[PDB]
Design an enzyme around this catalytic site. Sequence first.
Site, PDB file in Angstrom:
ATOM      1  N   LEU A  13      49.304  46.059  43.180  1.00 13.37           N
ATOM      2  CA  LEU A  13      48.240  46.738  42.432  1.00 13.37           C
ATOM      3  C   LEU A  13      46.902  46.549  43.146  1.00 13.37           C
ATOM      4  CD1 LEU A  13      49.178  45.717  38.763  1.00 13.37           C
ATOM      5  CD2 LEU A  13      50.144  47.524  40.171  1.00 13.37           C
ATOM      6  N   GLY A  16      44.010  41.519  49.092  1.00 12.48           N
ATOM      7  CA  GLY A  16      42.804  40.977  49.724  1.00 12.48           C
ATOM      8  C   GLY A  16      43.044  39.686  50.487  1.00 12.48           C
ATOM      9  N   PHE A  18      42.418  36.843  49.555  1.00 13.81           N
ATOM     10  CA  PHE A  18      42.871  35.848  48.585  1.00 13.81           C
ATOM     11  C   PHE A  18      44.385  35.910  48.385  1.00 13.81           C
ATOM     12  CE2 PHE A  18      43.704  34.240  44.299  1.00 13.81           C
ATOM     13  CZ  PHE A  18      42.985  33.054  44.298  1.00 13.81           C
ATOM     14  N   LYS A  32      50.040  37.406  39.847  1.00 18.13           N
ATOM     15  CA  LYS A  32      49.133  37.069  40.946  1.00 18.13           C
ATOM     16  C   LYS A  32      49.878  36.176  41.950  1.00 18.13           C
ATOM     17  CE  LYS A  32      44.715  36.531  39.822  1.00 18.13           C
ATOM     18  NZ  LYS A  32      43.410  35.948  39.386  1.00 18.13           N
ATOM     19  N   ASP A 119      33.110  33.828  35.546  1.00 16.80           N
ATOM     20  CA  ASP A 119      33.366  35.041  36.339  1.00 16.80           C
ATOM     21  C   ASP A 119      33.430  36.270  35.441  1.00 16.80           C
ATOM     22  OD1 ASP A 119      33.795  36.594  38.593  1.00 16.80           O
ATOM     23  OD2 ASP A 119      35.633  35.568  39.234  1.00 16.80           O
TER      24      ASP A 119
HETATM   25  F1  0SB Z   1      44.540  39.690  36.488  1.00 12.47           F
HETATM   26  C1  0SB Z   1      45.813  39.975  36.839  1.00 12.47           C
HETATM   27  F2  0SB Z   1      46.525  38.817  36.868  1.00 12.47           F
HETATM   28  F3  0SB Z   1      45.826  40.551  38.077  1.00 12.47           F
HETATM   29  C2  0SB Z   1      46.366  40.871  35.770  1.00 12.47           C
HETATM   30  C3  0SB Z   1      46.763  40.280  34.588  1.00 12.47           C
HETATM   31  C4  0SB Z   1      47.261  41.062  33.570  1.00 12.47           C
HETATM   32  N1  0SB Z   1      47.337  42.433  33.724  1.00 12.47           N
HETATM   33  C5  0SB Z   1      46.924  43.033  34.901  1.00 12.47           C
HETATM   34  N2  0SB Z   1      47.013  44.432  34.924  1.00 12.47           N
HETATM   35  C6  0SB Z   1      46.546  45.309  35.923  1.00 12.47           C
HETATM   36  C7  0SB Z   1      46.900  46.650  35.843  1.00 12.47           C
HETATM   37  C8  0SB Z   1      46.504  47.522  36.843  1.00 12.47           C
HETATM   38  C9  0SB Z   1      45.760  47.073  37.920  1.00 12.47           C
HETATM   39  C10 0SB Z   1      45.431  45.726  38.013  1.00 12.47           C
HETATM   40  C11 0SB Z   1      44.585  45.219  39.110  1.00 12.47           C
HETATM   41  C12 0SB Z   1      44.444  45.823  40.354  1.00 12.47           C
HETATM   42  C13 0SB Z   1      43.571  45.283  41.284  1.00 12.47           C
HETATM   43  C14 0SB Z   1      42.816  44.163  40.967  1.00 12.47           C
HETATM   44  C15 0SB Z   1      42.933  43.568  39.711  1.00 12.47           C
HETATM   45  N3  0SB Z   1      42.169  42.433  39.312  1.00 12.47           N
HETATM   46  C16 0SB Z   1      42.716  41.382  38.433  1.00 12.47           C
HETATM   47  C17 0SB Z   1      41.637  40.954  37.428  1.00 12.47           C
HETATM   48  N4  0SB Z   1      40.529  40.349  38.168  1.00 12.47           N
HETATM   49  C18 0SB Z   1      39.930  41.265  39.160  1.00 12.47           C
HETATM   50  C19 0SB Z   1      40.988  41.928  40.064  1.00 12.47           C
HETATM   51  C20 0SB Z   1      43.811  44.120  38.800  1.00 12.47           C
HETATM   52  N5  0SB Z   1      45.806  44.862  36.990  1.00 12.47           N
HETATM   53  C21 0SB Z   1      46.428  42.251  35.938  1.00 12.47           C
END
Ligand code: 0SB
Length: 262
Positions: A13, A16, A18, A32, A119
């Site tokens: 999704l 980077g 990180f 993650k 954050d």
């Molecule tokens: F935080 C997370 F663990 F990644 C998480 C937890 C629960 N649901 C989702 N859901 C979706 C759904 C669609 C696209 C994304 C997504 C794409 C790029 C960066 C981030 N983010 C994560 C949040 N912090 C800034 C970057 C999230 N995420 C994500």
Amino acid sequence: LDRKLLTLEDKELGSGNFGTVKKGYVKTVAVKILKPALKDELLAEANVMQQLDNPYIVRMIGICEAESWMLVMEMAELGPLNKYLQQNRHVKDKNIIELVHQVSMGMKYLEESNFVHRDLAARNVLLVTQHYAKISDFGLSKALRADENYYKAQTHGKWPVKWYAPECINYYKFSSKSDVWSFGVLMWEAFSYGQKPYRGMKGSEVTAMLEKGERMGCPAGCPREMYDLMNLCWTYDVENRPGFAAVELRLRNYYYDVVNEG
Ligand SMILES: FC(F)(F)c1ccnc(Nc2cccc(-c3cccc(N4CCNCC4)c3)n2)c1
């Protein structure tokens, strides 16, 4: 967690320097993924999220260990608030008030639980529906010691300065009221349909702006009382700044007044 129960999809999704985020699984989840103490941060983040029980905070399922260290949480399908709004610029103002109010309910819980987020940004708010937002990204978050009102950062990390209050930049002092400052920037972001705050400015230039007393302006079509609330969140002196009890009650009432009309 038990890897055998989890199923990754090839497409990430986000990515980077990180790590990366992917979709999985009966319950749909987000993951993650790491790419020495980046694990500690993830375990620390996992430790924080385990303590948090609220509708407006992303709920952790657990952590998993395989080819990578993986943090597994409930899915918020529509993703980061900032991008969503960028892609959907006709979202009604009532719906934005709804969304930020939900973040403030989430943040009042975290305040009440004596956690600081550190954050709070539009990028870190995820959308379950168009009408349901959750707070994400507790990687910088700290439990306040029983004997302390703030968290004292012992070093300058890579800090989202444009979201950070003067006391954070000046004293490395992080409290719930610092998160309130960030909520204002987040508010501004939401009503600006996912515009980056202080565009065209370096972090040091933002500090110089704020010290003069200069604030980001009213977003086009943002009701004045919501811009007032942003500015109140941007109280320079942290003593005079409201906490989320005050902030959430302001939003709570306004959102109902705005419900009153249609
Ligand atoms: F935080 C997370 F663990 F990644 C998480 C937890 C629960 N649901 C989702 N859901 C979706 C759904 C669609 C696209 C994304 C997504 C794409 C790029 C960066 C981030 N983010 C994560 C949040 N912090 C800034 C970057 C999230 N995420 C994500």
